[PDB]
Amino acid sequence: ANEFRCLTPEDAAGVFEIEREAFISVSGNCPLNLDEVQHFLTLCPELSLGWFVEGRLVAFIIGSLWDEERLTQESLALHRPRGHSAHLHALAVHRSFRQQGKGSVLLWRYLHHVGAQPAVRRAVLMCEDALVPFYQRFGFHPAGPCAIVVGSLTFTEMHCSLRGHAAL
């Protein structure tokens, strides 16, 4: 099979009860799902999207809504219901399906999925300088400052308008 649907607490639980799965095309910044994201599948499963092959979860993205122009340390673990931005918290490519383009395919679909919601006017995320060029492939642009620090690392804040005048 091959399905793309939102995640459930069950799914999350299924991910935690096994070994370990890859981060999006980056070493060092290995996958951190350590509950900082699990609660999102309770507060807002609509902002998650998993890729299932014959039922098996091969990749997923977990997000939440942000209601401010810029990201803050607290935003990274918050969900503001009446918010207009899809804050990406984790992009994972499971069972090592690395280098198969699955990360981009999922992301392309995720932005389209969340962009379909009338209130979600844009996607927002934090990322290591190394991954900046990557996120730019999907419409993201470096917003600027945003002094968020996961660990000790200084991340670049990325924004992606989901609303655009289609002409070509």
Residue of 79, 87, 89, 159 marked active site? 89
Q: Tell me if 55 is assigned to a ligand binding site.
A: no
The answer to the question of whether 101 is labelled as a binding residue is yes
Is 117 among the annotated ligand-binding positions? Answer: no
Is 99 labelled a binding residue? yes
Is 56 within 8 Å of 106 (Cβ atoms)? no
Please indicate if the annotation marks 110 as binding a ligand.
no
Q: Say whether 111 is catalytic.
A: no
The two structure tokens encoding residue 27 = 């070493």
Tell me the HSE value of 90 on the side-chain side, using a 13 A CA sphere: 27
- Retrieve residue 37's tokens: 């994201």
Question: Alpha helix locations (H) across the chain?
Answer: 9-16, 40-43, 102-115, 132-136
Is 48 an annotated catalytic residue? no
Does the active-site annotation cover 64?
yes
Q: Which tokens is 99 given?
A: 């280098």
Annotation says 135 is catalytic? yes
158 assigned ligand-binding residue: no
Tell me the binding residues for acetyl-CoA: 91-93, 99-104, 135-137
Residues noted as catalytic? 64, 78, 89, 91, 135
Tell me the binding residues: 91-93, 99-104, 126, 135-137
